[PDB]
Ligand binder design. Structure first.
Ligand SMILES: Nc1nc2c(ncn2[C@@H]2O[C@H](COP(=O)(O)OP(=O)(O)O)[C@@H](O)[C@H]2O)c(=O)[nH]1
Ligand SMILES: [Mg+2]
Length: 365
């Protein structure tokens, strides 16, 4: 019966994220690139959660950009004593750059703060700071609690943990399943057979492709349309192929010269080709197998999107001159060929087949 949701705690060091994570688990029970990540699983009445808490700054940066999970929502932990602090802002910004869809706030350490008027002012400030980065600060739920005192079993704080989790259960919706999204299949291989026409293999990323459906071929070249005359696997002929399936798809009236790896098939109009975009990117450290030297405004490495890579030129934001191994940066990119893309799409940066970066499209230009 029970739906799955990926969430995780964000906010400034020491504000209570790890404590809150253990309070939530305690209470609910009673009822290459390296990322340090504590994962816990727990349940409410209505839902199953996979929850990540990170120790270090770098970990949040890397988990957010090059995940593993992808957060359907985040719990912003903020100390009522202190107020929002620099990493409060940084994590809000990152969540916006990478497309964390919803936020719920837990104002923590309310056991250290009598004075209702002060709590309201800290609350108003959290709200404004959320709205600076276009989250709807006026409607976000903010619960006032104490993770410490909830683990001691103190009743009023145990109930604030439940108030949080009720809020999460209601305000953070379940992610749209991939099968209910517009059809999309990145193309891996292309075969021309004289008997049949041209078939493109790959994995359906989303939706359903049905024999007789019409699809666009998007990216690299100009968007052409066609109709699907066949779906297949090794000795099976199928009427359709769905999200997760590896299939060959037979296309009608398509010369082999007119499709290639890196293009996608897609429901007509569902996705458009682009060369220019903004992205948040994490640059790997020497130790992660990345660069050991900085790069600058000209830099022109390979961008890997779905099944292919395209050369692109990187422009740094105003007042950033260099990027070191281990930084994260918002960069603007112009690729030499268009690629089917949307905000939220993740990609790698490589040079000579060696991974130097991981990124996500934050804005299409
Ligand atoms: N007074 C009080 N202290 C807390 C509360 N939650 C956490 N702390 C304390 O603040 C410190 C940092 O908490 P922790 O969960 O490690 O912070 P994190 O870095 O955000 O994960 C620890 O000493 C906690 O015991 C709370 O609800 N009330
Ligand atoms: Mg912690």
């Amino acid at each position: 019966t029970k739906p799955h949701v990926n969430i995780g705690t964000i906010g400034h060091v020491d504000h209570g994220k790890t404590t809150l994570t253990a309070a939530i688990t305690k209470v609910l029970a009673e009822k290459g690139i390296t990322i340090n990540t504590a994962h816990v699983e727990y349940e409410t009445e209505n839902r199953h959660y996979a929850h990540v808490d990170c120790p270090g700054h770098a970990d949040y940066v890397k988990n957010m950009i090059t995940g593993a999970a992808q957060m359907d929502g985040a719990i912003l932990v903020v100390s009522a004593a202190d107020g929002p602090m620099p990493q409060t802002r940084e994590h809000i910004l990152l969540a916006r750059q990478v497309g964390v869809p919803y936020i719920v706030v837990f104002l923590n350490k309310c056991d250290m703060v009598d004075d209702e008027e002060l709590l309201e002012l800290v609350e108003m400030e959290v709200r404004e700071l959320l709205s600076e980065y276009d989250f709807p600060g006026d409607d976000i739920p903010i619960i006032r609690g104490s993770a410490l005192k909830a683990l001691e079993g103190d009743e009023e704080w145990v109930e604030k943990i439940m108030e949080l989790m009720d809020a999460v259960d209601s305000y953070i919706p379940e992610p749209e399943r991939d099968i209910d999204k517009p059809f999309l299949m990145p193309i891996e291989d292309v075969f021309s057979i004289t008997g049949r026409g041209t078939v493109v293999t790959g994995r359906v990323e989303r939706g359903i492709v049905k024999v007789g459906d019409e699809v666009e071929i998007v990216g690299l070249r100009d968007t052409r349309k066609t109709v699907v005359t066949g779906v297949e696997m090794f000795r099976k002929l199928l009427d359709e192929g769905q999200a997760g399936d590896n299939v060959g798809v037979l296309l009608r009236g398509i010369k082999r010269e007119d499709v290639e790896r890196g293009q996608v098939l897609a429901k007509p109009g569902s996705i458009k080709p682009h060369t220019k975009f903004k992205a948040e990117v994490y640059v790997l450290t020497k130790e992660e197998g990345g660069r050991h030297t900085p790069f600058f405004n000209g830099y022109r490495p390979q961008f890997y999107f779905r099944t292919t890579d395209v050369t692109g030129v990187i422009t740094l934001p105003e007042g950033v001159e260099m990027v070191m191994p281990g930084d994260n940066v918002t960069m603007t990119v112009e690729l030499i060929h268009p690629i089917a893309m949307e905000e939220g799409l993740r990609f790698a940066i490589r040079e000579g087949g060696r991974t130097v970066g991981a990124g996500v499209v934050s804005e299409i230009i």
